[PDB]
Amino acid sequence: PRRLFEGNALLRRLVRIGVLDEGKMKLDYILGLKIEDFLERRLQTQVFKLGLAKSIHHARV
Amino acid sequence: MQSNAGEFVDLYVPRKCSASNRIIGAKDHASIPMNVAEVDKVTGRFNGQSKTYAICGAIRRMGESDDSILRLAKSHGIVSQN
Amino acid sequence: SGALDVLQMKEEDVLKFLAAGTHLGGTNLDFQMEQYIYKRKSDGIYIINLKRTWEKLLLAARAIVAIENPADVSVISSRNTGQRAVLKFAAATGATPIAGRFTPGTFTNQIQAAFREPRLLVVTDPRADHQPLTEASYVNLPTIALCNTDSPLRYVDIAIPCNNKGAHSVGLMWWMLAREVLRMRGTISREHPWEVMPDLYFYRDPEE
Amino acid sequence: GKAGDKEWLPVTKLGRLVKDMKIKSLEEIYLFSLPIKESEIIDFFLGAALKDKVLKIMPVQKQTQAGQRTRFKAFVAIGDYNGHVGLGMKCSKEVATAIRGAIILAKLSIVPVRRGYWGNKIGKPHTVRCKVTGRCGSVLVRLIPAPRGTGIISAPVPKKLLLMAGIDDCYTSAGGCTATLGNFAKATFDAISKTYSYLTPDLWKETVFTKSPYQEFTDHLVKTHT
RNA sequence: GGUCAUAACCAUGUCUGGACGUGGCAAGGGUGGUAA
């Protein structure tokens, strides 16, 4: 019971922010995560990516 | 070696010597394959298909090989009774 | 063996072995050289069996045949008796002789104008030609030789027991070796007697 | 143009089959555990992925009645990230020559490494086959398998070698002196070598055996060829 | 199966001395002139 309930709710949260696919969703793919995917989900990155800026330096301001 | 993907990984499968059932390196320079030529055994003349063996350098350098080559060949030809 | 009588002992050759004193063997044993001896004499001599000689002659010879190009089965001897013998050997069957002092580093070097690179070796007497044997295990050569009854076995894949303290025992054994390889590879086989004499495979010896 | 090239003429048997092109991988050479003697053979199959990483350039010197006499001894690593690495040391009276002497010697001693998985397969190995060791004069390393994404956790010196090997994740433990790095690096190199010599239940299936490249291609090695 | 001898004494040291650091291979050019 510990492995099921924990893993399910862990992976749910990784999917909810979208640093992980649901075409993955196994505990092994947690380990395939890396630094850059987190940093992509940051607000200033998403401002730049999907809204008006001229550089990343603009977007933070 | 086979993964769950069915990918047949590892650069090469190394040969396993018949001397003592263990595996040689890739820089062991005392490990020798020795090809014996078969004959028809009706007239005594060369006939095609060789019997090939392989022996590891470890048993060779201590000097066990003379018995090993004999024992391998004794269960076949051209020694069947010694 | 298993061939009818054409790869089995002949009545003729028994006489030749015994006249050349090959059956007699030195006064010492090893822990590897006691599987070819039968027993000891009244005297300190230890009597090699000739049945045991005959089988070992054959599969030894069959390996010498198995190379496609015979021009690189390099024979070696440095003791005086096995000099005249090897020269006729390597004339009869395609081989490369190395008579006298070996000059070490022959196969180890890259730069040397006497560089060789054979596949097999056939050596007389391990404890006189120890230099090429040691060097064999740096270039992955199989090895064959003629052991007495006390020669050290180490880097010897197959042995062919013999008396080999000189006399006719040396030259006779190299002659028999050359007889077999031609029956198997060539078309000299007829199972009726070979023309060539074991006489001119013997030692030169100080002449009249 | 006005300038040709001519590079490499083999005087070695193994060199001749490669130059005439009948051997087409290193894996053929290694399976018969043949000597290599010419450093162009290795650099023909590879040499399109080999880097060098000069570890140390260390002085040594002997004594004579006229004073000091100094020789420079340098260690140089070599390896592609596909699993072939090697190592060499060499000394000479001058510096640059010693380095270039070491890059040759290092090419000669290249060996393969065998990689495996932590415990569950998902394709593309990432770690060491099993927990192995290797000692050189009271320095040793104990390469211990590791799960994905932990990187190579080692001192700076073995972190070079293991990275060049393409081994992604590893844990190590050392014992004894490691400030005499000539031992330390050779001991790492020793450990990675043993991977193919370690018997595993995988390898218990029987190997077919096949005739030597020397044997099969002997008709091309005799015409005028060495 | 091979033949040969006698050792005294003998301590100490003013002294602020040694050039070593990274694999470049690598000029690349011709107006005058017999003829013209």
UniProtKB/Swiss-Prot annotation, chain A:
It comes from the Eukaryota. The modification N6-acetyllysine is found at residue 49. Disulfide bonds: none annotated. There is a cross-link at residue 26 (Glycyl lysine isopeptide (Lys-Gly) (interchain with G-Cter in SUMO2)). It is found in: Cytoplasm; Nucleus, Nucleolus. Belongs to the universal ribosomal protein uS4 family. Component of the small ribosomal subunit. Identified in a IGF2BP1-dependent mRNP granule complex containing untranslated mRNAs. Part of the small subunit (SSU) processome, composed of more than 70 proteins and the RNA chaperone small nucleolar RNA (snoRNA) U3. Component of the small ribosomal subunit. The ribosome is a large ribonucleoprotein complex responsible for the synthesis of proteins in the cell. Part of the small subunit (SSU) processome, first precursor of the small eukaryotic ribosomal subunit. During the assembly of the SSU processome in the nucleolus, many ribosome biogenesis factors, an RNA chaperone and ribosomal proteins associate with the nascent pre-rRNA and work in concert to generate RNA folding, modifications, rearrangements and cleavage as well as targeted degradation of pre-ribosomal RNA by the RNA exosome. This is Small ribosomal subunit protein uS4. The chain holds residues 68 to 128 of 194 of the full protein.
Swiss-Prot record, chain B:
Keywords: Acetylation, Cytoplasm, Endoplasmic reticulum, Isopeptide bond, Ribonucleoprotein, Ribosomal protein, Ubl conjugation. One of its GO terms (cellular component) is ribonucleoprotein complex. One of its GO terms (biological process) is translation. There is a cross-link at residue 41 (Glycyl lysine isopeptide (Lys-Gly) (interchain with G-Cter in SUMO2)). GO terms for molecular function: structural constituent of ribosome. It is found in: Cytoplasm, Cytosol; Cytoplasm; Rough endoplasmic reticulum. The modification N-acetylmethionine is found at residue 1. Gene3D superfamilies: 3.30.1230.20. Coiled coil: none annotated. Belongs to the eukaryotic ribosomal protein eS21 family. Component of the small ribosomal subunit. The ribosome is a large ribonucleoprotein complex responsible for the synthesis of proteins in the cell. Component of the 40S small ribosomal subunit. This is Small ribosomal subunit protein eS21. It comes from Oryctolagus cuniculus (Rabbit).
UniProtKB/Swiss-Prot annotation, chain C:
The keyword Nucleus applies. One of its GO terms (molecular function) is laminin receptor activity. Its main location: membrane. Residues 160-179 are annotated as: Laminin-binding. There is a cross-link at residue 88 (Glycyl lysine isopeptide (Lys-Gly) (interchain with G-Cter in SUMO2)). The record marks 114-115, 132-133 as: Cleavage. Residues 53-112 are annotated as: Interaction with PPP1R16B. The modification Phosphoserine is found at residue 42. GO terms for biological process: ribosomal small subunit assembly; translation. Keywords: Acetylation, Cell membrane, Cytoplasm, Host cell receptor for virus entry, Host-virus interaction, Isopeptide bond, Membrane, Nucleus, Phosphoprotein, Receptor, Repeat, Ribonucleoprotein, Ribosomal protein, Ubl conjugation. One of its GO terms (cellular component) is plasma membrane. The modification N-acetylserine is found at residue 1. Acylated. Acylation may be a prerequisite for conversion of the monomeric 37 kDa laminin receptor precursor (37LRP) to the mature dimeric 67 kDa laminin receptor (67LR), and may provide a mechanism for membrane association. It is found in: Cell membrane; Cytoplasm; Nucleus. It comes from the Eukaryota. The modification N6-acetyllysine is found at residues 51, 88. The modification Phosphothreonine is found at residue 96. The keyword 4Fe-4S does not apply. Required for the assembly and/or stability of the 40S ribosomal subunit. Required for the processing of the 20S rRNA-precursor to mature 18S rRNA in a late step of the maturation of 40S ribosomal subunits. Also functions as a cell surface receptor for laminin. Plays a role in cell adhesion to the basement membrane and in the consequent activation of signaling transduction pathways. May play a role in cell fate determination and tissue morphogenesis. Also acts as a receptor for several other ligands, including the pathogenic prion protein, viruses, and bacteria. Belongs to the universal ribosomal protein uS2 family. This protein appears to have acquired a second function as a laminin receptor specifically in the vertebrate lineage. This is Small ribosomal subunit protein uS2. It comes from Oryctolagus cuniculus (Rabbit). The gene is RPSA.
